[PDB]
Design a protein around this ligand. Structure first.
Ligand SMILES: Nc1ncnc2c1ncn2[C@@H]1O[C@H](COP(=O)(O)OP(=O)(O)O)[C@@H](O)[C@H]1O
Ligand SMILES: Nc1ncnc2c1ncn2[C@@H]1O[C@H](COP(=O)(O)OP(=O)(O)O)[C@@H](O)[C@H]1O
Lengths: 107, 436, 289
């Protein structure tokens, strides 16, 4: 069996990933950015198709993605200065995510 | 394949490597990808790839930690491949390497492993050896077990095992305790030239064995003492995997008046075996001072002996001779002749900028207090040279240990790690040192 | 103050030349509730004990305890070590006492060592002595060492005016762990405090906490250059520092070295360094470099 610490906590999510993607807006007119989402939900690798969207979208996206995620609190980060995407409001362009790898941390 | 040439590192972080946006853009590697790196004799290594602007599109800025696991020197090529399978880890078993722990007792985990992985998401491969600094030293750890297998990214959920036995340093595995370019600071222009001269002959032996061009065979480093000449020389030796042989002035001139030359000769002999080799003659003014500086026939028989061995050095069995001295005047003009030390590099004293660098290099293993302003320290050490700052640092540290020592912190009996990891050097510690 | 069990102190140099005296800072006596003359019992190394009298000190530091070499030895400690001080209200004026001089300290002189040394020494002083302690008495242009063989009221007693003093014929032998107070100490150096202080801290860690540098990457000092006119006390200092830290002391003398033939000279040089490393911690002193 296991022991404790300080951290936190079927295949139909091909549809989950589909609805996660179909949830988007992609201003043909507007410039892109793609994102590598590191789901804490495990070594869950994610691919984006964003174009200068805001963190609320990344959040709703993960929610659309994994079911659990829909109720679990967490924060989004940038590894190596390791900063935590603070104001989840701002467009990817302001945060300098443009083709980055945002890792999910369960708080 | 977009194979890259390995160059210098810029953030002291080991797990990170750097390329240029232009380089990354072509393979869709994004500002954080856990890229895989394959290289020399059965070696791979997973690392987080960021991006740099001063990096050249064909070069990849990494540190000696990676490089070594990759078994490669600055200048080689590597295949930077995106590693998608890399998944958070469940457990990992690592063990401290003897020579890097002898001295310290107590839980390593608490002092090194923990603060090292803590919310960092460091991707590690098997067999890899990483360096953890702190407690006024830098322990080396060997990854002997992972779960996920081959590799993984240590997450805040990964278990860390520190089983009870310090393993050994396999002789195919170099120490990070050895001198390298990252250990020299302030010498950029000169440290540049040296690399530039030694490059081909030390790195590409065969070339000259096919062309009729004359390579540099004797480099002469000037500069006052403590400037880092012995440092620079040994660094270049390790940095290029070249054989290093040390000949010290006093050591030679201490022998009998025959035993001396005997050595000078046996010295060059053993270097021609392990070539490419770098023969460093420290304190050359001791073996070959200028014309009028000599008094006896013996002193002269040796200087001559040295001049000869130089001329005898052929293009075949390439070895570069480096010698340091405090200034031109010192040496015997004959050593300058085309064929001998015809390549001279002047290494002065550091400036405020340079001094800063050196000070950071000599504190990388210590816990500096937030009230520590090295840049300030750098600014009030005008004359000071590398050795002065390096020593200054030792004084600060020692001064701090003396303070929190009387508190009866177990001292006098073989050491405890955590104890050393708490002791922090205050700006007052430097202040005290300065006034000494 | 939290951990020191309020009686653990660091042995510092003495200010009062009296051997029976040890000093503490007033704020320290108050904490331990001792009196300006209270007789205390000190515990050192090799499970040794000493009985001394306590006085306040304005220059003494809260954690440290001043005491001269005599007591420091009896306790088997060096400056910098720690001891436990304890009140000793059970001491009682002693009936009889038998002390004996040490062979090497009385060679040459003859006569009644009692009326010449023991008498003026204990006379109306009220010196608290333990059994086994070694005290020094100066006079007659020399200093004699005496070892308390036996005290009436057993472990320790205060030599009152009625206490019978026996010093029956015989000079005992000096044991191995018992250094001579005739050896050089910091109390034999005057006019150097500043410099004596610099040197002390320089060698402090390397010579007192060797293990430290075994587990450290910091570089301690190796060579120390002492410059000054002749007869300034450099040799004296170096020898004093060695003993005072229980380090091995090896002496190289310029002329000696230069009187030999060349190869012999080198030989000797490396021999000095060789022997030094075998008995480390050590201090090699090159006189007349
Ligand atoms: N430029 C430098 N950067 C970092 N450390 C230095 C530098 N120069 C000197 N040092 C430190 O001082 C010591 C001086 O070494 P060394 O190369 O032997 O000096 P030199 O040959 O000029 O007498 C080095 O081992 C190193 O720790
Ligand atoms: N500072 C001093 N304090 C007390 N006595 C001293 C001092 N300096 C010298 N002496 C006395 O004079 C002698 C001179 O000794 P020494 O240390 O050998 O001199 P130096 O090494 O300076 O030539 C000492 O043995 C000592 O008796």
């Amino acid at each position: 069996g296991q022991k404790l610490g300080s951290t936190a906590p079927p295949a139909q999510q091909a549809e989950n990933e589909a609805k996660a993607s179909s949830s988007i807006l992609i201003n043909e007119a507007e410039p892109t950015t793609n994102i590598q989402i590191r789901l804490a939900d495990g070594g869950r690798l994610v691919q984006k198709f964003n174009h200068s969207h805001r963190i609320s979208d990344i959040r709703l996206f993960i929610v659309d993605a994994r079911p659990a995620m829909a109720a679990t609190s967490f924060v989004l980060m940038t590894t190596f200065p390791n900063k935590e995407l603070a104001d989840e409001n701002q467009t990817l362009k302001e945060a300098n995510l443009l083709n980055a790898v945002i890792v999910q941390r369960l708080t | 394949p977009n194979r890259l040439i390995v160059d210098e590192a810029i953030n002291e972080d080991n797990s990170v490597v750097s390329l240029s946006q232009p380089k990354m853009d072509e393979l869709q590697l994004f500002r954080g990808d856990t890229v895989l790196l394959k290289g020399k004799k059965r070696r791979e290594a997973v690392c987080i790839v960021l991006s740099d602007d001063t990096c050249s599109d064909e070069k990849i800025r990494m540190n000696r930690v990676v490089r070594n696991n990759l078994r490669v020197r600055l200048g080689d090529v590597i295949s930077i491949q995106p590693c998608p399978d890399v998944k958070y880890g469940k457990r990992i078993h690592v063990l401290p390497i003897d020579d890097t722990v002898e001295g310290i007792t107590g839980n390593l985990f608490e002092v090194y492993l923990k603060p090292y992985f803590l919310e960092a998401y460091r991707p590690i491969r098997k067999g890899d050896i990483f360096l953890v600094r702190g407690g006024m030293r830098a322990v080396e750890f060997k990854v002997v077990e992972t779960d996920p297998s081959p590799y993984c990214i240590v997450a805040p959920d990964t278990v860390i095992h520190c089983e009870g036995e310090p393993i050994k340093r396999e002789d195919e595995e170099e120490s990070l305790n050895e001198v390298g370019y990252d250990d020299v600071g302030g010498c950029r222009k000169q440290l540049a030239q040296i690399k530039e001269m030694v490059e081909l002959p030390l790195r590409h032996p065969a070339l000259f064995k096919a062309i009729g061009v004359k390579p540099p065979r004797g480099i002469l480093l000037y500069g006052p003492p403590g400037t880092g000449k012995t440092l620079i020389a040994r660094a270049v030796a390790n940095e290029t995997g070249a054989f290093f042989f040390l000949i010290n002035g006093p050591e030679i001139m201490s022998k009998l008046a025959g035993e001396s030359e005997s050595n000078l000769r046996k010295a060059f002999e053993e270097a021609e075996k392990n070539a490419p080799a770098i023969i460093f003659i420290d304190e050359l003014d001791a073996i070959a001072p200028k014309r009028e500086k000599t008094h006896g026939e013996v002193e002269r028989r040796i200087v001559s002996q040295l001049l000869t061995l130089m001329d005898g050095l052929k293009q075949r069995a390439h070895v570069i001779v480096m010698a340091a001295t405090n200034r031109p005047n010192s040496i015997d003009p004959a050593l300058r002749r085309f064929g001998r030390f015809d390549r001279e590099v002047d290494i002065g004293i550091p400036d405020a900028t340079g001094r800063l660098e050196i000070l950071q290099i000599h504190t990388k293993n210590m816990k500096l207090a937030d009230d520590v302003d090295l840049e300030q320290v750098a600014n009030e050490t005008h004359g000071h040279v590398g050795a002065d700052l390096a020593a200054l640092c030792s004084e600060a540290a020692l001064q701090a240990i003396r303070k929190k020592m009387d508190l009866i912190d177990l001292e006098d009996e073989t050491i405890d790690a955590e104890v050393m990891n708490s002791l922090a050097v205050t700006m007052d510690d430097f202040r005290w040192a300065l006034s000494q | 103050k939290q951990k020191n069990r309020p009686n653990r102190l660091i042995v510092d140099e003495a200010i009062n030349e009296d051997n029976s005296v040890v000093s503490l800072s007033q704020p320290k006596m108050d904490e331990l509730q001792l009196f300006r003359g209270d007789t205390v019992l000190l515990k050192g190394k090799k499970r040794r004990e000493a009985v001394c009298i306590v006085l306040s000190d304005d220059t003494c530091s809260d954690e440290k305890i001043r005491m001269n070499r005599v007591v420091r030895n009896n306790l088997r400690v060096r400056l910098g070590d720690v001891i436990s001080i304890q009140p000793c209200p059970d001491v009682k004026y002693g009936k009889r006492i038998h002390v004996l001089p040490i062979d090497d300290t009385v060679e040459g002189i003859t006569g009644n060592l009692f009326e010449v040394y023991l008498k003026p020494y204990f006379l109306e002083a009220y010196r608290p002595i333990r059994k086994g302690d070694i005290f020094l008495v100066r006079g007659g242009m020399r200093a004699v060492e005496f070892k308390v063989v036996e005290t009436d009221p057993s472990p320790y007693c205060i030599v009152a005016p009625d206490t019978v003093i026996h010093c029956e014929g015989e000079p005992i032998k000096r044991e191995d762990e018992e250094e001579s107070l005739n050896e050089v100490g910091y109390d034999d150096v005057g006019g150097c405090r500043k410099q004596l202080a610099q040197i002390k801290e320089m060698v402090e860690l390397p010579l007192r906490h060797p293990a430290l540098f075994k587990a450290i990457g910091v570089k301690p000092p190796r060579g120390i250059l002492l410059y000054g006119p002749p007869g300034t006390g450099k040799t004296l200092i170096a020898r004093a520092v060695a003993n005072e830290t229980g380090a091995f002391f090896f002496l190289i003398n310029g002329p000696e070295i230069m009187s030999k033939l060349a190869g012999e000279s080198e030989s000797n040089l490396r021999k000095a360094f060789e022997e030094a490393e075998k008995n480390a911690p050590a201090i090699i002193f090159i006189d007349e470099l």
